[PDB]
């Protein structure tokens, strides 16, 4: 059954990034997906994505750019306090310079470089670099 519905947009972006596609058709559009790509959109790792609506679940057609390498998804959502947030930024993020760990804190989905500013902690969602 379709277990993790965040996850296989990120294995359809990453899979279709590698072959170098320019547009990507996700299915079926969580509002955690759109909150995730908007985090990937403020940093320009993604185009402007359009949500072709059904009355079923939603479908997204995403425009790809070609700036990113890997969007993954940390299943299960491990509970990540602020103190062990640094543990993950060594692991998932390939340099201290760039890269992002998206996590759901309670004050809205933000990456670690916002939640380490707003002093929030939450559960982890995914990453990208």
């Amino acid at each position: 059954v379709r277990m993790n519905v965040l996850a296989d947009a990120l294995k359809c972006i990453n899979n279709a990034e590698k072959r170098g596609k320019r547009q990507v058709l996700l299915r079926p559009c969580s509002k955690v997906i759109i909150k995730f790509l908007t985090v990937m959109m403020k940093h320009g790792y993604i185009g402007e994505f359009e949500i072709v609506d059904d009355h079923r679940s939603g479908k997204i057609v995403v425009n790809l750019t070609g700036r990113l390498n890997k969007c993954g998804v940390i299943s299960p959502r491990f509970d990540v306090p602020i103190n062990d947030i640094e543990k993950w930024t060594n692991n998932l993020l390939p340099s201290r310079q760039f890269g992002y760990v998206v996590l759901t804190t309670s004050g809205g989905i933000m990456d670690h470089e916002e939640a380490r500013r707003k002093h929030l902690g939450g559960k982890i969602l995914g990453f990208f670099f």
Partner: protein
């Protein structure tokens, strides 16, 4: 593939490892602990013994020599040992049926060289420290 990757499966993850460290061949001397069963001394480091013979253990192939070992009965438990005396000579320092401090043989349970299945090593015979006898750095007890 494989692991119970949920978030509420730390019961399966600990009961699996608990059941699968038995197949870690060297962590079955934490679990089954045969030290008091199969080791010639009951888990100690050294052992005082009393020499019974002078066994000329011949060398295994493809090396020919004769290793000149010694068959100890201990005093700790009444097990039996075939120990070993190194560094040529020093069977002349045995003065048979007089006590011996045998020791482990440095491969932690196996015979080492061309010696077939002999797992020990004399370190003191009549309390005079055999490494201080090839130089004869101390006097051998003779009378």
């Amino acid at each position: 593939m494989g692991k119970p990757r949920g978030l509420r499966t730390a019961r399966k993850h600990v009961n699996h490892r608990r059941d699968q460290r038995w197949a870690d061949k060297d962590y079955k001397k934490a679990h089954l602990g045969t030290r008091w069963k199969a080791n010639p001394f009951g888990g100690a480091s050294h052992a005082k013994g009393i020499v019974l013979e002078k066994v000329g253990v011949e060398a295994k192939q493809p090396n020919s020599a004769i290793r000149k070992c010694v068959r100890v009965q201990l005093i700790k438990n009444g097990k039996k040992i075939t120990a070993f005396v190194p560094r040529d000579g020093s069977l002349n320092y045995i003065e048979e049926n007089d006590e011996v401090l045998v020791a482990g043989f440095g491969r932690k349970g196996h015979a080492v060289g061309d010696i077939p299945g002999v797992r020990f090593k004399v370190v003191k015979v009549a309390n005079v420290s055999l490494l201080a006898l090839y130089k004869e750095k101390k006097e051998r007890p003779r009378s």
